[PDB]
Design a protein around this motif. Structure first.
Motif, PDB file in Angstrom:
ATOM      1  N   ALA A 128      -8.256   2.427  -2.240  1.00  0.00           N
ATOM      2  CA  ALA A 128      -6.859   2.320  -2.807  1.00  0.00           C
ATOM      3  C   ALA A 128      -6.044   1.220  -2.035  1.00  0.00           C
ATOM      4  N   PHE A 129      -6.457  -0.055  -2.144  1.00  0.00           N
ATOM      5  CA  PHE A 129      -5.863  -1.162  -1.438  1.00  0.00           C
ATOM      6  C   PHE A 129      -5.039  -2.107  -2.366  1.00  0.00           C
ATOM      7  N   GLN A 130      -4.893  -1.792  -3.647  1.00  0.00           N
ATOM      8  CA  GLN A 130      -4.316  -2.765  -4.636  1.00  0.00           C
ATOM      9  C   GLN A 130      -2.961  -2.284  -5.135  1.00  0.00           C
ATOM     10  N   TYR A 131      -2.447  -1.245  -4.499  1.00  0.00           N
ATOM     11  CA  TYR A 131      -1.216  -0.561  -4.871  1.00  0.00           C
ATOM     12  C   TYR A 131      -0.053  -0.804  -3.878  1.00  0.00           C
ATOM     13  N   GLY A 132      -0.165  -1.758  -2.955  1.00  0.00           N
ATOM     14  CA  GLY A 132       0.788  -1.861  -1.838  1.00  0.00           C
ATOM     15  C   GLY A 132       0.727  -0.704  -0.852  1.00  0.00           C
ATOM     16  N   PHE A 172      -9.419   5.052   3.523  1.00  0.00           N
ATOM     17  CA  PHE A 172     -10.909   4.954   3.557  1.00  0.00           C
ATOM     18  C   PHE A 172     -11.391   3.906   2.546  1.00  0.00           C
ATOM     19  N   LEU A 173     -12.471   3.180   2.966  1.00  0.00           N
ATOM     20  CA  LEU A 173     -13.168   2.236   2.082  1.00  0.00           C
ATOM     21  C   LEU A 173     -14.675   2.635   2.029  1.00  0.00           C
ATOM     22  N   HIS A 204      -3.785  -9.841   6.491  1.00  0.00           N
ATOM     23  CA  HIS A 204      -2.402  -9.367   6.674  1.00  0.00           C
ATOM     24  C   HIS A 204      -2.280  -7.840   6.582  1.00  0.00           C
ATOM     25  N   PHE A 205      -3.396  -7.148   6.256  1.00  0.00           N
ATOM     26  CA  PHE A 205      -3.385  -5.657   6.226  1.00  0.00           C
ATOM     27  C   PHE A 205      -3.124  -5.091   7.618  1.00  0.00           C
ATOM     28  N   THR A 206      -2.118  -4.182   7.681  1.00  0.00           N
ATOM     29  CA  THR A 206      -1.681  -3.554   8.939  1.00  0.00           C
ATOM     30  C   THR A 206      -1.736  -2.005   9.016  1.00  0.00           C
ATOM     31  N   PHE A 207      -2.527  -1.350   8.155  1.00  0.00           N
ATOM     32  CA  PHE A 207      -2.768   0.107   8.300  1.00  0.00           C
ATOM     33  C   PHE A 207      -4.230   0.353   8.674  1.00  0.00           C
ATOM     34  N   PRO A 208      -4.556   1.521   9.295  1.00  0.00           N
ATOM     35  CA  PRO A 208      -5.904   1.923   9.701  1.00  0.00           C
ATOM     36  C   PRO A 208      -6.862   2.082   8.482  1.00  0.00           C
ATOM     37  N   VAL A 209      -7.995   1.351   8.620  1.00  0.00           N
ATOM     38  CA  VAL A 209      -9.070   1.419   7.579  1.00  0.00           C
ATOM     39  C   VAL A 209     -10.254   2.107   8.201  1.00  0.00           C
ATOM     40  N   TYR A 264     -12.510  -2.808  -2.725  1.00  0.00           N
ATOM     41  CA  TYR A 264     -11.660  -3.415  -1.724  1.00  0.00           C
ATOM     42  C   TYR A 264     -10.427  -4.227  -2.236  1.00  0.00           C
ATOM     43  N   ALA A 265     -10.290  -4.360  -3.590  1.00  0.00           N
ATOM     44  CA  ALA A 265      -9.165  -5.132  -4.292  1.00  0.00           C
ATOM     45  C   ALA A 265      -7.861  -4.876  -3.571  1.00  0.00           C
ATOM     46  N   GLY A 266      -7.342  -5.923  -2.946  1.00  0.00           N
ATOM     47  CA  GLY A 266      -6.061  -5.909  -2.244  1.00  0.00           C
ATOM     48  C   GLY A 266      -6.112  -6.106  -0.777  1.00  0.00           C
ATOM     49  N   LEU A 267      -7.215  -5.780  -0.102  1.00  0.00           N
ATOM     50  CA  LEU A 267      -7.392  -6.052   1.317  1.00  0.00           C
ATOM     51  C   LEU A 267      -7.454  -7.543   1.672  1.00  0.00           C
TER      52      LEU A 267
END
Ligand code: NI
Length: 341
Positions: free
Chosen positions: A17-21, A30-31, A45-50, A39-42
């Protein structure tokens, strides 16, 4: 906005769930695997825990440039506590690094999210043997009985025997294999092993393969195309025009191409046995479509679910039409009535 079937209730978690802001309430994303629809959206500049496998984390760092401080790799088959909740990652039998996720919720509910998977009887002797599952979030890609295909082992036997025969008849034939994502590496590795060759490819694809923890990979692949008689090309180039254009570039080393297009299921699986598969041919170029699947067949899916006996199923594929949803719900009820859960 994030749809319901990507949220894990009773947690701060989302899956793929990376394409929803910024998703409200999400403390860990989780990925399941490194395929673009998931991975759509990662990005860097991503700043949350994956949270992911080790292999997925190598791809995130080197291919998408996600900073290291936000990548959280977990080992497989190992109970781990994330943000106060017990989880386990299991091999999904999909592409390299792909996992299923078991979540042990604080209220006693147990959820399995399959990600993308190819169900196998070996999964009946994983950590799933030990306990009950209340909710299954299921890869329903081929949830209909018309979707049939052979084992990966039969498909690889066909590819190796076809390539070895052709190149023994004509030592000046080149073999080409198409690719557009990770997964299905056994196709080109098995063909290059029978031919006594490294596999040749672009720098971009070499870099991707170097992230996959494949044993002895340095012995198996190269960017020196001139030294190799099995070449990788983008899937889009696997056609008579693109193959012709490629053969020109090889400096008169070769006078024939044999090419493979691994697909998923195609409607020719309705009629033709793997053994009886024939190529499309134009002059000195032949192209084989081979049905190498990394998703469950209908029968493999049905066996898995009848063994697991989940209390509720949430499909994660084919969810956009009423007709697809009604078809899948009918098969879930059949399976439950037949097995008695
Ligand atoms: Ni996938």
């Amino acid at each position: 906005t994030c749809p319901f079937y990507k949220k894990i209730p009773g947690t701060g978690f989302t899956v793929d769930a990376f394409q929803y802001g910024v998703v409200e309430g999400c403390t860990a994303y989780f990925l399941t695997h490194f395929h673009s629809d998931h991975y759509a959206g990662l990005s860097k500049h991503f700043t949350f825990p994956v949270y992911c496998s080790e292999i997925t984390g190598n791809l995130l760092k080197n291919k998408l440039h996600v900073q290291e401080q936000y990548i959280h790799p977990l080992p497989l088959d190992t109970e781990c506590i994330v943000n106060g909740v017990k989880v386990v990652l299991l091999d999904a039998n999909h592409c390299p690094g792909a996992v299923m996720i078991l979540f042990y919720l604080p209220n006693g509910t147990v959820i399995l999210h399959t990600g993308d998977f190819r169900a196998d009887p070996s999964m009946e002797r994983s950590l799933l043997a030990d306990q009950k599952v209340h909710m299954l979030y299921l890869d329903t890609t081929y949830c209909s009985p018309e979707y049939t295909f052979p084992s990966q082992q039969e498909v690889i036997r066909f590819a190796i025997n076809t390539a070895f025969e052709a190149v023994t008849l004509n030592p000046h034939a080149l073999v080409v294999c198409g690719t557009y994502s990770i997964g299905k590496e056994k196709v080109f590795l098995a063909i290059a092993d029978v031919l006594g060759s490294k596999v040749g490819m672009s720098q971009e694809k070499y870099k991707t393969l170097q992230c996959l923890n494949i044993p002895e990979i340095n012995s198996l692949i190269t960017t020196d195309m001139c030294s190799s008689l099995v070449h990788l090309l983008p899937m889009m180039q696997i056609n008579f025009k693109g193959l012709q254009s490629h053969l020109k570039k090889c400096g008169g080393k070769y006078n024939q191409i044999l090419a493979f297009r691994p697909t998923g299921w195609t409607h020719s699986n309705k009629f033709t046995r793997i053994a009886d598969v024939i190529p499309q041919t134009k002059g000195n170029i032949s192209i084989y479509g081979i049905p190498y699947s990394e998703h469950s067949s209908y029968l493999e899916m049905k066996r898995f679910v009848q063994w697991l006996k989940p209390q509720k199923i949430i499909p994660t594929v084919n969810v956009g039409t009423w007709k697809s949803r009604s078809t899948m719900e009918k098969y879930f009820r059949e399976w439950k009535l037949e097995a008695g859960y």
